[PDB]
Each structure stands twice: as C-alpha cells, then as structure tokens.
Design an enzyme around this catalytic site. Sequence first.
Site, mmCIF file in Angstrom:
data_model
loop_
_atom_site.group_PDB
_atom_site.id
_atom_site.type_symbol
_atom_site.label_atom_id
_atom_site.label_comp_id
_atom_site.label_asym_id
_atom_site.label_seq_id
_atom_site.Cartn_x
_atom_site.Cartn_y
_atom_site.Cartn_z
ATOM 1 N N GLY A 62 2.761 6.001 9.908
ATOM 2 C CA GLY A 62 4.146 6.014 9.461
ATOM 3 C C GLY A 62 4.916 4.776 9.890
ATOM 4 C CG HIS A 84 -0.652 0.093 2.511
ATOM 5 N ND1 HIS A 84 -0.317 1.290 3.129
ATOM 6 C CD2 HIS A 84 -0.650 -0.890 3.443
ATOM 7 C CE1 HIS A 84 -0.025 0.978 4.383
ATOM 8 N NE2 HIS A 84 -0.214 -0.325 4.622
ATOM 9 C CB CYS A 137 3.041 1.115 7.238
ATOM 10 S SG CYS A 137 1.325 0.617 7.579
HETATM 11 C C1 I3R Z 1 0.647 1.313 9.081
HETATM 12 C C2 I3R Z 1 0.598 2.760 8.714
HETATM 13 O O1 I3R Z 1 1.517 3.523 8.976
HETATM 14 N N1 I3R Z 1 -0.522 3.212 8.072
HETATM 15 N N2 I3R Z 1 -1.532 2.358 7.627
HETATM 16 C C3 I3R Z 1 -2.447 3.076 7.066
HETATM 17 C C4 I3R Z 1 -3.640 2.461 6.446
HETATM 18 C C5 I3R Z 1 -4.676 3.257 5.949
HETATM 19 C C6 I3R Z 1 -5.844 2.679 5.479
HETATM 20 C C7 I3R Z 1 -5.999 1.313 5.494
HETATM 21 C C8 I3R Z 1 -4.972 0.511 5.953
HETATM 22 C C9 I3R Z 1 -3.795 1.077 6.420
HETATM 23 C C10 I3R Z 1 -2.183 4.557 7.128
HETATM 24 C C11 I3R Z 1 -0.763 4.635 7.725
HETATM 25 C C12 I3R Z 1 0.254 5.170 6.741
HETATM 26 C C13 I3R Z 1 0.811 4.348 5.793
HETATM 27 C C14 I3R Z 1 1.772 4.794 4.897
HETATM 28 C C15 I3R Z 1 2.203 6.089 4.907
HETATM 29 C C16 I3R Z 1 1.662 6.976 5.851
HETATM 30 N N3 I3R Z 1 2.070 8.285 5.903
HETATM 31 C C17 I3R Z 1 1.573 9.132 6.796
HETATM 32 C C18 I3R Z 1 0.591 8.710 7.708
HETATM 33 N N4 I3R Z 1 0.181 7.448 7.664
HETATM 34 C C19 I3R Z 1 0.687 6.537 6.773
#
Ligand code: I3R
EC number: 3.4.19.12
Lengths: 305, 305
Positions: free
Chosen positions: A143, A41, A145
């Site tokens: 963040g 993602h 992730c």
């Molecule tokens: C795990 C993680 O950091 N994130 N997961 C997110 C998500 C959103 C909808 C459905 C499933 C998972 C959002 C968040 C995220 C992922 C990647 C980059 C980011 N940048 C800033 C803020 N959040 C994220």
Amino acid sequence: SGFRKMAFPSGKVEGCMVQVTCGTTTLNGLWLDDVVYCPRHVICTSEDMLNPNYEDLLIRKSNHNFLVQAGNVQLRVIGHSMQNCVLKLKVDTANPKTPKYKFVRIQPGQTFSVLACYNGSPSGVYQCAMRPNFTIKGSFLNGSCGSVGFNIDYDCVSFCYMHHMELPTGVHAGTDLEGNFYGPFVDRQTAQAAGTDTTITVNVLAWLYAAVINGDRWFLNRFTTTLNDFNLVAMKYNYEPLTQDHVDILGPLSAQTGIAVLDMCASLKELLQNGMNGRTILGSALLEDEFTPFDVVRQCSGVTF
Amino acid sequence: SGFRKMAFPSGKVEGCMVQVTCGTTTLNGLWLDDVVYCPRHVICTSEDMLNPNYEDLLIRKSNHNFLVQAGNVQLRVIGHSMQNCVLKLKVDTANPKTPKYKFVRIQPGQTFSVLACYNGSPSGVYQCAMRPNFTIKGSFLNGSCGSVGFNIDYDCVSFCYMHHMELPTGVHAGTDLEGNFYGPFVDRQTAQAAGTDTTITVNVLAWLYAAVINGDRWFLNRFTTTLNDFNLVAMKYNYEPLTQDHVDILGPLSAQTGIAVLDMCASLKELLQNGMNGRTILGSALLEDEFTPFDVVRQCSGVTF
Ligand SMILES: *CC(=O)N1N=C(c2ccccc2)C[C@@H]1c1cccc2nccnc12
Ligand SMILES: *CC(=O)N1N=C(c2ccccc2)C[C@@H]1c1cccc2nccnc12
C-alpha cells in the site's frame, strides 16, 4: 550538541498526497498543479504483475476508470497518459497547497527524506540514502506504493523518488518523478538482482568529522596515508574509491576541525583493519554511511527552511 | 518490508512555530489558540543564567517587551504570566492553523517526535525516547530552545516536551507544556547530574520481535528463562527490570511471531552475556531501546494519521 538521522519537515509534501484507485487497486499519488503522479502498476491486478504489458493494459482504461481522492473530496480526471513507469492523471482542479517544486534525479550516495503513506494519508517520515547499487533500505508495507522521497532548499521542494516495489531481498526499488527507475529494475513480479552494494566512503568520512565536532575523538590515530594507499584498503572492504572531488567536498569539515582529509582516511583505514574493539562512535557500533558532507554541515549550522 | 526510526509527519506542528524575542534573546515559541508558550529563560541575558531570580527578572518586563513573530507578521501581546519554567504570552489573535491538541506528561521509556527549530522556522524532524534518567539524546544547537516534542493520534497532536537546555555531558533537558522539568533539572547555568542511565528492557524486546518479523532470526536460542532469573542478568547490565505489565504489553508481538516473551528474554540474556560476535540485527551492531512495543506494531500495520 548531538547528532541524529534527521528528516526534513514534511508539511509541504503532506498537502500533496492523494489516494488513487483503478478498479481493485489503491495506491498513493502526488498532486502538483492539475496533475496526479502515481506508479503505472495501479492499472494491474495481482495476476497481471507476473508479466504485464502496460501498453495493452492501459488501452482498456478510460479517464472515468481512475478515482482520485484528496481528503474526502473526489477530483475529476480529464486526461491520462503513461510516462515511462509513471501514470499522469490530469485533473480539473489545481492543488491549492502546491508548493514551489522541482523534479530531480539524484546521484547514488545522496540522501533524501521519505514520507511513507497508506491510502493517501501520511504515517511517518525518515531519512534514506540512494545506495551505490540504486536500492534504498526503507520501511514500506503493501500500500506504500506512490510514497515519495524529497529534499528541501528553503521554500523549494525537490522530489527525487517514487516508491514502486520491494525486491525479494527486502530492499526497495523505485523511480524518479519522470518514471525512470533508479537501477536496472523493472515493474514486474520477477526475481531481480540488485548487485553488490558498496559503502559510501565520502559519507563515512563526513560522519567521522561530525563525531570529532561532538567530542568523540578516540579513533584519531598518529598515522596519515595517500589516496591510492587508502583505495587499496577501500577496494578490499567494498568501499567506493575516494577521489579529489570527495576531498574537496570534505574541505569545510576538515577546516572546521583542523584534521586533514588524508589523516581522517588513515583513521578509517585502522577502523576497517582492526574494528571498533567494543567501542561506539556517535552511539553506533558500525561505520555509518547514510550522512552526506552536506547533512553534517546543515546539522552543525542549524539551517532552516 | 524494513524497519526504520520513523518520526510522525510534522505539518500540524510547523503551523504552530513562532519566534519570540525579549530584548537581546530570541527563541522558539508554540502558538496554540491565543497563547504562545516558550521557555521562561527568554527573559534572561547570558550573565543572568548563572543564578537567575525569575520572579525579579519578570517584574522588569511588560507586554510590550515581548515580540512574537509568525512568518513576517507581528502578533500583539496583551498578557503575560509564568507557569513553572514556561512563559505564557497571551496574544490578540488565535492561530488559524491550531490543530486538535492535548498537553501530556510522558513516562520514561516512551518515545516522541522532535521538530528542531531555529528563529521560529523548522529545520528537521526526528524520533526520541525519554530516558529512564529523564534526559533525551537529541540534536540541538544554540537557538533550538522552545522546540517541541509530540505524538499524533489520527487528528490529535499530543505535545509532551519543550526544549530548555543542554547539560555539560551533551544530553538534553526540558519540560512538559505546563513548564515542569522532566527529572531533577533546573533552568540555570550550573553543573547538573543526570544520574545513571538504564536500558529500556521492554523496548529492546519489542525491537527483537520486529527483527524476527523482518527475517532476522539468528539470535533465537533453544533456551527459556524466568522473570526473576532474567532480572538477575538485567540488574548486572543496567537494564530496567521486566514486570508482568511489560510481558502483557508485548502480547500482540508474541502472538504474531509464535515466540513466548520468556523465550525472547533467554535470547536477550545470551546476547547480553556473549555479545553479537560481529553480527548485526536490523542493520545495527548494538541492542536498540528507543522503539516502544507500540512503535513496532504501528510500523508493521501501516497506521495512518
Ligand atoms: C509498493 C506496493 O505497495 N506494492 N508493490 C507491489 C508489487 C507487486 C508485484 C510486483 C511489484 C510490486 C504490491 C504492493 C501494492 C501495490 C498497489 C496496491 C496494493 N494494494 C494492496 C496491497 N499491496 C499493494
Ligand atoms: C536551548 C538553547 O537554545 N539555549 N539554552 C541555553 C542555556 C544557557 C544557560 C543555561 C541553560 C540554557 C543557551 C541557548 C540559547 C537560548 C536562548 C537564546 C539563544 N540565542 C542564541 C544562542 N543561544 C541561545
């Protein structure tokens, strides 16, 4: 001597954390040899997450659309591919800090250490258990992730988890390092059910042995029980049933303390039926299930890596 | 998002752990630049520990009586000296893995990460608080002596604790990196009193703010109190008195949640007077005091190192 929730030393894993950017989205990646692993993602915008078609979204991306950074150095991406819910970016240079490693899919009830990262940089390390319902109760902000879970066996790092999302209930969901989710979760912003969580009975028993090893013995009663009688009490309290495999695994701690597993089961039964009556065990007023029988033995022997 | 007892990444500290042997005794040392730091009782036998005269025992030792090993490489000792309860061994080679570092003497109530070691090798990492009575509740077996406690500020490692001994009560005692014990403890095998331990009130309040930030709000009541009225309840429960300095430190968490510090004090007062009534806060059935206001903010911002 004491008993603590102890994580593995994280040095071998810090050297593998990179930052991966694809357009507006930045997350953490794992750099082992000439490949960077990260949640797929990373290719999505916030709007795409409502109903993503990953195959169509990935087709719009070329190698030059992925920016990989390790420290202040930009790695060059020479290949990309999707493996289940993980993106694999082939880079032109192998990580000189790659440790001896394995990818493993852990079983529910087993534990591992998490190195929580933001922008490719580590912030902290803590121990987690994969719940019987395949969720984890970690500490993860936006963040985080791409942050990974792992175990160490002397020199070999076994990676078992990659963080992908937080469920609307507050618990966390993710995949193994082949991109396969633990549980029925999907990488989409939709309401998802984790299901009924149960208590890891073999882990609560291991923790009761560690309490006896460290002088806490008040909970020991004059009763014994049977495997089926105990399981009648386990089902009522949403505890996973105990089997002869679990009894065998508890063997060393039973031999060390002189307390038969079935006698420790009778003490657990009275704790479930009568509570703790204002008392504590190993500094806790609840029954702890996030310590495996192995985590108890390692902490009483002083096994090093 | 979750709330966990999180330790700092330990990579910078793993690179400094060495094994120090003096005759029959082996323990851990800290190698920074061309100096190895370790507990001075590395020069003692088991019998010497009953009543050691360190000055007389050290005079019988020369540079060649100290063996320092980092991995499978033997460092050559070219100088030795005692600084309070720490032995400083000057070696011929500087540690190429020496991070940016400071030695600090932490205050009671502050937290730090411990990297528990055996034979110069790391086994695990966990977070600790220096209790108001200057003891720590860690996990340390025989051989863990010389294991260090630390905090990290981006690139700078601040070493604050060196493990020396376990008291007959099960709690742990040690020194700063200048060899000065925290508390009234001495490096001798004699029965020693730690004194009455108190609860770190400012830390319990910080943890209540983190609970509200993560959706746990049941404990919030319709009452308020005063600093002196709250302290009348704190003294009865062996809680350290709250001061305007503690209220100021809680300022950011109070501003983030909309809950005045004195209103959170009234909720703590009713929790102290009426218990938790079978309920939990952040997965705990006890009031937690091992998280400083800083540890709460770091975990809600995602500060990296
Ligand atoms: C795990 C993680 O950091 N994130 N997961 C997110 C998500 C959103 C909808 C459905 C499933 C998972 C959002 C968040 C995220 C992922 C990647 C980059 C980011 N940048 C800033 C803020 N959040 C994220
Ligand atoms: C901290 C630690 O490992 N130890 N502290 C010990 C001690 C004994 C008497 C009085 C104060 C402290 C014993 C133990 C220890 C130290 C050094 C070497 C060892 N080798 C084997 C087993 N234990 C130790």
